[PDB]
Ligand binder design. Structure first.
Ligand code: HEM
Ligand SMILES: CC1(C)[C@@H]2CC[C@@]1(C)C(=O)C2
Ligand SMILES: [K+]
Ligand SMILES: [K+]
Length: 407
């Protein structure tokens, strides 16, 4: 292929595995299945793909976890593949390594953390119910657009104090950063997201509100006032986390539930298992994969890594690794030890994971109680999409209104 970058002199020929992050060959089998090919019998723990400019890929949880823990060798400064995206990526605190990362992470944690989630609980609850009830009698829906997107996004926009009418533009921009269609480079999408924020940040620094943006813009980092530039780099990240994470996960989960009546019946019969089901689904349908850049030449697991080399450390793969979970592709709500790195690992552990679990658990509970029985629209060929964050293109669902019930 002409999409293969010349193999660098230091990368062993036998370690080449041309996996394409943005268009994995086995995509038709499902995105997680497509990435799992990296864990087949004769694939080593660490491989090099010539796709997307050329980069390393850790295929097992042991290495993924080790690398995320060693920020001195594996820096978050250039976290995205391709290298151009990684270089343009300057969100805070994600593009920083400890120790400088911490003072900013603390502030971000204050705007989307548990205390904030507890506060949003009732509104999250109300929106879920409102959306599901309006869909209930129709006996059908395009899940991605009718629920997966509006539910998590409106909650984030509510938190950020931003008008919902701005969602089409913002969502388009965020998606170009994770699963670009080619219309925009990462740099262009980032510049447009920042352009959107600049005047809003200025406005709220002059007249502070109680929304997440105001809190960030008027916040302090270890005692000193955050700058306009810093607030922009943090708010941009929050927007991406709010618009392109839970939105995708919900569709993976609901697609699975629509194709598995037995699992639905398990949660219907024993709803107290929903939280556990949530964690198991987060493992099986993990969907994130970013990485790091080598700060210096370093021998890792018998492989010579060179300064500047990029290494993809798929958060998605840890929990799908059979060395972490037996029968990894099987969904077992009773799974004894659900091992995964779905929300990351190390100093950059996901800050929105608490908001995320709340949204997921609320969805499972409120949907199954009103629409306990549903399936994929007949003949529908569900398509997944791969990138920094993977997703589902469309999920047409159907059900008999007669089997539903208002709650
Ligand atoms: C199912 C949903 C979600 C998944 C799977 C997810 C996953 C992750 C992962 C893998 C990381 C670490 C990446 C790295 O180490 O470079 C991370 C970081 C982060 N996430 Fe989430 N996330 C989710 C939802 C959210 C939401 C709803 C927000 C809220 C805006 C959010 C905010 C953040 C922030 C601010 C960080 C940066 C932490 C840091 O760099 O110190 N996430 N997330
Ligand atoms: C890898 C992520 C899921 C995490 C939150 C949004 C995201 C795309 C980032 O840039 C950090
Ligand atoms: K070589
Ligand atoms: K960078």
């Amino acid at each position: 292929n002409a999409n293969l970058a010349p193999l660098p002199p230091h990368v062993p020929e036998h370690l080449v595995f041309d996996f394409d992050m943005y268009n994995p060959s086995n995509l038709s089998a499902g995105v997680q299945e497509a990435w799992a090919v990296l864990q087949e019998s004769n694939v080593p723990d660490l491989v090099w793909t010539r796709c997307n400019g050329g980069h390393w890929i850790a295929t097992r949880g042991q290495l993924i976890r080790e690398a995320y823990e060693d920020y001195r060798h594996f820096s978050s400064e250039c976290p995205f593949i391709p290298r151009e995206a990684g270089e343009a990526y300057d969100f805070i605190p994600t593009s920083m390594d400890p120790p400088e990362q911490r003072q900013f992470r603390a502030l971000a944690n204050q705007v989307v953390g548990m205390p904030v989630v507890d506060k949003l609980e009732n509104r999250i609850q109300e929106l879920a119910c409102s959306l599901i009830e309006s869909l209930r009698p129709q006996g059908q829906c395009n899940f991605t657009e009718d629920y997966a997107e509006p539910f998590p996004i409106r909650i984030f926009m509510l938190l950020a104090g931003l008008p919902e009418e701005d969602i089409p533009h913002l969502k388009y921009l965020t998606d170009q950063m994770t699963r670009p269609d080619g219309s925009m480079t990462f740099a262009e999408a980032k510049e447009a997201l920042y352009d959107y924020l600049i005047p809003i940040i200025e406005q709220r620094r002059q007249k502070p509100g109680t929304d997440a943006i105001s809190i960030v813009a008027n916040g302090q980092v270890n005692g000193r006032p955050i700058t306009s530039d810093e607030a922009k780099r943090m708010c941009g990240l929050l927007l991406v986390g709010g618009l392109d994470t839970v939105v995708n996960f919900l569709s993976f989960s609901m697609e699975f539930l629509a194709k598995s009546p037995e699992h639905r019946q398990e949660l219907i019969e024993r709803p107290e298992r929903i939280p556990a089901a949530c964690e198991e689904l987060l493992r099986r349908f993990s969907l994130v994969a970013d990485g790091r850049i080598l700060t210096s030449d370093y021998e890792f697991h018998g492989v010579q890594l060179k300064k500047g080399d990029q290494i993809l450390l798929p958060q998605m793969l840890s929990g799908l690794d059979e060395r972490e979970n037996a029968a990894p592709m099987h969904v077992d709500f009773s799974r004894q030890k659900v091992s995964h790195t779905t929300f990351g690992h190390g100093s950059h552990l996901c800050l929105g994971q608490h908001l995320a679990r709340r949204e997921i658990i609320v969805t499972l509970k409120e949907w199954l109680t009103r629409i306990p029985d549903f399936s994929i629209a007949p003949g529908a060929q569900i398509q997944h999409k791969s990138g920094i964050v993977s997703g589902v293109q469309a999920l047409p669902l159907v059900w008999d209104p007669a089997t539903t019930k208002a709650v």
